[model samples]
Target: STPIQQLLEHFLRQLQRKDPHGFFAFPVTDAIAPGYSMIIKHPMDFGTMKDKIVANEYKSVTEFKADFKLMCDNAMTYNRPDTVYYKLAKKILHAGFKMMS
Candidate 1:
């Protein structure tokens, strides 16, 4: 897997450890981001509450990778200044590079 892919999978592992219940609570649905649906497939069919968004929640390693790629490639582009999400994305991407190097 690519470095960023590894980072995303690692993040999912960490999320699993932090909150098993909440982890289950988070939905693994389709791309909320338009025109970025191809990134993920076989969206996870778990999670309860369908009314709210699941923060930092992902269905599969592939799903996480897709989301990360989307964030870097489009959502969190250089033209857009860093928001909270971008800040976290920056840290995560940096960590991935450090680990891979």
Candidate 2:
């Protein structure tokens, strides 16, 4: 499905955020899990959104990636400088994020 692959690309490029390997794992792992909503924001259609953006001839995927990137930029602008999610995202890239569960 390339679902995971596309998600990873979206997260890394759009999020303006990266892990230790310089990337986020959420995009890839989230798509793989059968029940993924618990782990993602807008879980039901985030993947579908990506698909639509990429397949549409009217807009380029790169443009989609850029627009999505705005969300991350806005977040950093509105939120604190140090965020737990971004930090953990980095941890996961270097050596799997630790989850007590």
Candidate 3:
């Protein structure tokens, strides 16, 4: 249970950082290796997070969870229909909240 929680939070953190705007309109696939690999590549404008992300340091799992929650909350707050991003955001937020609890 404890390991599961850690993995959940780790994955949630990856998603939150990978697509803060919830704009990942593509389908979830095994090819989507959004993890340390992404950080190593530094593909996007990660700002100050570039180094931290590259190092795979998230301050703490608790911090990562909080950021994930905030991302989800923001998605709902700025939600607009007629867009797949928002739809996916809703699903991510729905499942994220449940897992966090």
TM-score of 1: 0.31
Sort order, TM-score high to low:
3, 2, 1
Residue ranges of candidate 3 with Cα displaced over 4 Å:
1-51, 55-57, 97-101
lDDT per residue (tens digit) for residues 17-98 in model 3? 5466645422223354334233332222123233344455665567555545554454444445666545766677667666
- Top-down lDDT ranking: 3, 1, 2
True-vs-predicted CA distance for residue 68, candidate 3, Å: 1.4
Question: Please, what are the lDDT tens digits per residue for candidate 2 over residues 34-79?
Answer: 4444534432123444455456521444554443443344333333
Residue ranges of candidate 2 with Cα displaced over 4 Å: 1-48, 54-58, 85-101
The better-scoring model by TM-score among 1 and 3 is: 3
What's the lDDT of the predicted structure labeled candidate 1?
0.41
Candidate 1 residues lying further than 4 Å off, grouped into runs, are 1-71
Best by lDDT: 3
Model 1, 1-101: lDDT tens digits are: 54544555555455434334442334333444443345433233123212111443444555554543444344245224556535544555555434434
| Candidate 1: residue 22 Cα off by (Å) | 9.7
Model 2, position 8: C-alpha lDDT score:
44
Clashes in predicted model 2: 1
